[PDB]
């Protein structure tokens, strides 16, 4: 998958967007550059053997919204190295960099029920204490949770569920 | 549900929705023109791509064909319903008779029996062949391997073993043809039907014409049938036509599976792929499998990784030599390389053990003298060295024997020799009881009485 080759471009784009105070515009621009990449006919063209600059100018032709001489030049750079299919992964790493820079974390909470919303106030305060970031909750109700709740933040998980506790005790053979 | 996305030789990549990706060794199915093709899943790549091997000809496959996900591995009929019938790798009937009256189907991928279940046995099993049960005797429920290059008599020796054992033995038998000549399968089928012994034998044939996936999986099909008969509590005979073709079919696909080459270009998984197959051929406290396997030796190189790996898995090993075969001594067994777990004074008893080690010592000394003889000639030897040579040559001739399946080749009637006659004869030769007979008296005679009768007419 494109993650490893997408990282350098994501960093460069975020750094440039920080200098010119345009991060939000850059995000909305990369969204469009990634979305044109997903189109059928454009995807067939990307898999073809066009010389870099001809492909770059056709892509820039479709990507009209892009800020000329900044985003369109980013397309030219990626077209020199044929990374245009990595654009969905050049995006979302830009979003990751933004969330890190803005010291903000999406954190997820899965339970057997819709949580009491007072519970969510306590959970959000607790997460803003566990991690020194503002925490956006987007909790979920899940049938698999017999009872209790799972808290997931980044790649750390704190299992408070009855299902997990059962399959943790059932392990004690 | 699935879509074909690549076709490279025998390997087909299929994409599935990420919530539905098939398990490893699941069977998939795709319509190829006017026929149905099964694919077996080998690897899960990322993003719902899955990499599979075609159980059939992959020519004519397009990209973008819709693929059906069968929820189970390859499963084959087992039990008495298979007896007397010829079946394919997929467990399909290949003889022109009707459908197989199966009652049960077993997945061909299985685990070996646990260490607790294994059973020991020391019951010596007799054969009609002098050299085999003299030099490398083997027991009921053990494994025998015939090692040899191209055209040195692996199949003929295995057919003699079939004739003798699998007809004095009373239980069921399974014959697995793996990547060998179709002509030989048809010949075997008929001479089984003419003898009316076919109704005791299940035959699975994966011969060389088949594309690589069939040759890869057919051995597991045969083992699955043999395991059904073993777990029923019977005593079973399993014959494998050439085990080497299984490893070779692994080699052919390994590069297309994206695995770095090893050693002499073999797949890196060679030892594991051979071991998981071989460990399932085992006698158990519930029932016993006796196994005879042919093992082709590429370029006669016994140090090649495939024969070298095979050697550790067998109880008795008989090594056939092209250099002996070109003398016309048949069976072309090398007694200085053939060996058995059963050549042990406790099981065989002292007379047999002493006779075998005496023969081995004399033949080794003859090897030591041949380099002197090549340059100087024999006249320079000492008078005891000349006696060593004179006896070693007679021993080499007396290991020859006419076979019934070799009646068509030689034109002379086949011979069956009891073990006692072998021990008595070789002990007499080494003691010099027959120092007055010519060498020709010993060539292709069944027993020592026949050597003296041949000597009277030279």
């Amino acid at each position: 998958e494109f993650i490893t080759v997408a990282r350098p471009y994501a960093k460069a784009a975020f750094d440039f967007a920080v200098e010119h105070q345009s991060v939000e515009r850059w995000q909305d621009m990369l969204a469009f550059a990634a979305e044109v990449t997903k189109n059928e006919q454009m995807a067939e063209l990307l898999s073809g053997a066009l010389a870099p600059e001809t492909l770059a100018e056709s892509f820039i032709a479709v990507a009209g919204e892009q800020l000329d001489e900044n985003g369109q030049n980013l397309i030219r750079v990626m077209a020199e190295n044929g990374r245009l299919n990595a654009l969905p992964d050049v995006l979302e790493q830009f979003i990751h960099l933004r969330a890190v820079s803005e010291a903000t974390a999406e954190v997820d909470v899965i339970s057997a029920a819709a949580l009491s919303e007072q519970q969510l106030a306590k959970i959000s305060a607790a997460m803003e204490k566990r991690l020194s970031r503002k925490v956006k909750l987007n909790a979920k109700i899940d049938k698999s949770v017999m009872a209790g709740v799972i808290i997931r933040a980044g790649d750390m998980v704190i299992d408070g569920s009855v299902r997990g506790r059962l399959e943790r005790l059932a392990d004690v053979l | 549900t699935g879509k074909i996305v690549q076709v490279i030789g025998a390997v087909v990549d299929v994409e599935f929705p990420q919530d539905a990706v098939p398990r490893v060794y699941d069977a998939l199915e795709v319509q190829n023109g006017n026929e149905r093709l099964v694919l077996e899943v080998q690897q899960q790549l990322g993003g719902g791509i899955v990499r599979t091997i075609a159980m059939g000809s992959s020519d004519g496959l397009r990209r973008g064909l819709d693929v059906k996900d069968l929820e189970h591995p390859i499963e084959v009929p087992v039990g008495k319903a298979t007896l007397g019938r010829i079946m394919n790798v997929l467990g399909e009937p290949v003889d022109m008779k009707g459908e197989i009256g199966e009652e049960e189907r077993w997945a061909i991928h299985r685990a070996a029996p646990s260490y607790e279940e294994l059973s020991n046995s020391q019951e010596l099993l007799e054969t009609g062949i002098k050299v085999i049960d003299l030099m490398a005797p083997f027991a009921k429920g053990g494994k025998v391997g015939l090692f040899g290059g191209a055209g040195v008599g692996k199949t003929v020796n295995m057919m003699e073993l079939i004739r003798n054992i699998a007809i004095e033995h009373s239980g069921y038998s399974v014959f697995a043809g793996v990547g060998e000549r179709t002509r030989e399968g048809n010949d075997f089928y008929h001479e089984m039907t003419d003898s009316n012994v076919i109704d005791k034998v299940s035959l699975v044939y994966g011969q060389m014409n088949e594309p690589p996936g069939n040759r890869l999986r057919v051995a597991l099909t045969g083992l699955t049938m043999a395991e059904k008969f073993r777990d029923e509590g019977r005593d079973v005979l399993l014959f494998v036509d050439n085990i080497y073709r299984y490893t070779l079919a692994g080699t052919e696909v390994s590069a297309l599976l994206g695995r770095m080459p090893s050693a002499v270009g073999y797949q890196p998984t060679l030892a594991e792929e051979m071991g998981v197959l071989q460990e399932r051929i085992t006698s158990t406290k519930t029932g016993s499998i006796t196994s005879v396997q042919a093992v082709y030796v590429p370029a006669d190189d016994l140090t090649d990784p495939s024969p070298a790996t095979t050697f550790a898995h067998l109880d008795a090993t008989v090594v056939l030599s092209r250099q002996i075969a070109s003398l016309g001594i048949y069976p072309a067994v090398d007694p200085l390389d053939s060996t058995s777990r059963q050549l042990d004074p406790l099981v065989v008893g002292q007379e047999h053990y002493d006779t075998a080690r005496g023969v081995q010592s004399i033949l080794q000394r003859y090897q030591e003298l041949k380099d002197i003889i090549a340059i100087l000639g024999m006249d320079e030897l000492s008078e005891e060295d000349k006696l060593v040579v004179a006896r070693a040559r007679k021993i080499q001739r007396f290991l020859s024997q006419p076979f019934f399946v070799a009646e068509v080749f030689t034109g002379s009637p086949g011979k069956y020799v009891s073990l006692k006659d072998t021990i008595r004869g070789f002990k007499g030769i080494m003691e010099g009881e027959y120092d007055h007979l010519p060498e020709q008296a010993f060539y292709m005679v069944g027993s020592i009485e026949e050597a003296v009768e041949k000597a009277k007419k030279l």
Binding site: D159 | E116, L118, R259, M260, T303, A312, Q364
Partner: protein, 513 residues
């Protein structure tokens, strides 16, 4: 019998009482591919190299490649049930095995789960599978014997307690027989035994364990198994589990003898793992660090000084030196020692025993080649009687073989050369020995005294074997107090030489072969 099962049912009830309800926190990833026992995992930012990674079920993987954006790991068990998108939790744990005295007489797999079916283990806790060897200042010189019971090895190639001795040769030359006889002979020496089986077929292991059970050896032995069916990650780790079990005894003032069987198959399994992880192949397609693999395995076998034992035991054991002795086995393809794995293992060890096919077919069994076989520790490993007698044997025998080659067409033979050639043939005949028939120190010393003082010289060659048998029987019935003296002391003096001279004179006059 089964009323005690009601009692252990109460034990199950009290599991609930002991259990802990606290919610832990852990780091998480997802499996992104599965192939041939290797898995790629996305995530696991806090995974460490060599860490145990826990999978669905009760299955584990070892993290080996910590690349950017992915972890590559090998599954320690049947992998085919794993699937893409399965969640996976990183523990904090390194791999550990049960260890202790209770293991003796048990057959366990490389993870230490018993497979003999004799119920659960009794053990003294767990020890890390991967561990560093004692340093220079913590060791003591090897100066005690471990008896093989073979005339050839104990005379020519002595093994000391703490030595690493390579057994090397082609297939079906007696490599395993020598090692299990070395185990069998420890039944009463006080040395604990460990037999590690890498890549063997399970019925062969059952047969070897049966032979250990027919003799008295099984009660003193741990058997560690990784059969040819088991994964290449369960292989390649088995030697280290066996080494941990040996180290438990080594670090408490006790002696352990560990037999790694087919170190070469450990190398082959490691090559499989390395190629499936796409690591660059080196010479003969092995990875470059295979030498580091075997060297760090074999440098654990050591004799430690008493101070290290006291520090480890925290003063519970004082004044006792512990030792671990390793006997690795290597298979050569055609006597070709130039292969990569044999060259590495020959570089590492303290010597080697060459077994070869020409001697074995000639009937010289054990088929020990006196010339290319060597023991670096030297007479320092022997008892004084064996040291004194055996010093001459091996070099005299090697020069005998050279002299025979030079003689093969000389007709006139000078008396010095004739003496050497006759003596060399009779010594070559003397060192042959039957399997599972180990000889005590006194027996070997007596037979060597017969050889080195020329009592054999007149005896005709085929009768030398019956001479040896009759001499042992005679001395066992008539002169047992001296046998006890020699076996206990291993001493040698002018009165010992005089008593042996009297015994040889008396036997050779009075008795018949």
């Amino acid at each position: 019998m089964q009323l005690n099962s009601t009692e252990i049912s109460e034990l199950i009830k009290q599991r609930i009482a002991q259990f802990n309800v606290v919610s832990e926190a852990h780091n998480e990833g997802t499996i992104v591919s599965v192939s041939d026992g290797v898995i790629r995992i996305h995530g696991l930012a806090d995974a460490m190299q060599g860490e145990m990674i826990s999978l669905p079920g009760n299955r584990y993987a070892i993290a080996l490649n910590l690349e950017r954006d992915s972890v590559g790991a090998v599954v320690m068990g049947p992998y085919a049930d794993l699937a893409e998108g399965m969640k996976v939790k990183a523990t904090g744990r390194i791999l550990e095995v049960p260890v202790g005295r209770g293991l003796l007489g048990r057959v366990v797999n490389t993870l230490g789960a018993p497979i003999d079916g004799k119920g659960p283990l009794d053990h003294d806790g767990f020890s890390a599978v991967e561990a560093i060897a004692p340093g220079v200042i913590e060791r003591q010189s090897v100066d005690q014997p471990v008896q093989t019971g073979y005339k050839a090895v104990d005379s020519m190639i002595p093994i000391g307690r703490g030595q690493r001795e390579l057994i090397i040769g082609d297939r079906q030359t007696g490599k395993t027989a020598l090692a299990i006889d070395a185990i069998i002979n420890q039944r009463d020496s006080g040395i604990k035994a460990i037999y590690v089986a890498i890549g063997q077929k399970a019925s062969t292991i059952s047969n070897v364990v049966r032979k250990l059970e027919e003799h008295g050896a099984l009660a003193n032995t741990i058997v560690v198994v990784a059969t040819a069916s088991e994964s290449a990650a369960l292989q390649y780790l088995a030697p280290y589990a066996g080494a941990a079990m040996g180290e438990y005894f080594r670090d408490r003032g006790e002696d352990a003898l560990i037999i790694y069987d087919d170190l070469s198959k450990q190398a082959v399994a490691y090559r499989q793992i390395s190629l499936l992880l796409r690591r660059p192949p080196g010479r003969e397609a092995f990875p470059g660090d295979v030498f580091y693999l075997h060297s760090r395995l074999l440098e654990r076998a050591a004799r430690v000084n008493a101070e290290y034992v006291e520090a480890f035991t925290k003063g519970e054991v004082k004044g006792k030196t512990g030792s671990l002795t390793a006997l690795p086995i290597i298979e050569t393809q055609a006597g070709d020692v130039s292969a990569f794995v044999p060259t590495n293992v020959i570089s590492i060890t303290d010597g080697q025993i060459f077994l070869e096919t020409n001697l074995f077919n000639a009937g010289i069994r054990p088929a020990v080649n006196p010339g290319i076989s060597v023991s670096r520790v030297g007479g320092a490993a022997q008892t004084k009687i064996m040291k004194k007698l055996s010093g001459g044997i091996r070099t005299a025998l090697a020069q005998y073989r050279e002299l025979a080659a030079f003689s093969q067409f000389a007709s006139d033979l000078d008396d010095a050369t004739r003496k050497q050639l006759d003596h060399g043939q009779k010594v070559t005949e003397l060192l042959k020995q039957k399997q599972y028939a180990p000889m005590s120190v006194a027996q070997q010393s007596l037979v060597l005294f017969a050889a080195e003082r020329g009592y054999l010289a007149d005896v005709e060659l085929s009768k030398i074997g019956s001479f040896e048998a009759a001499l042992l029987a005679y001395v066992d019935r008539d002169h047992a107090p001296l046998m006890q003296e020699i076996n206990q002391t291993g001493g040698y003096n002018d009165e010992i030489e005089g008593k042996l001279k009297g015994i040889l004179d008396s036997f050779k006059a009075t008795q018949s072969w």
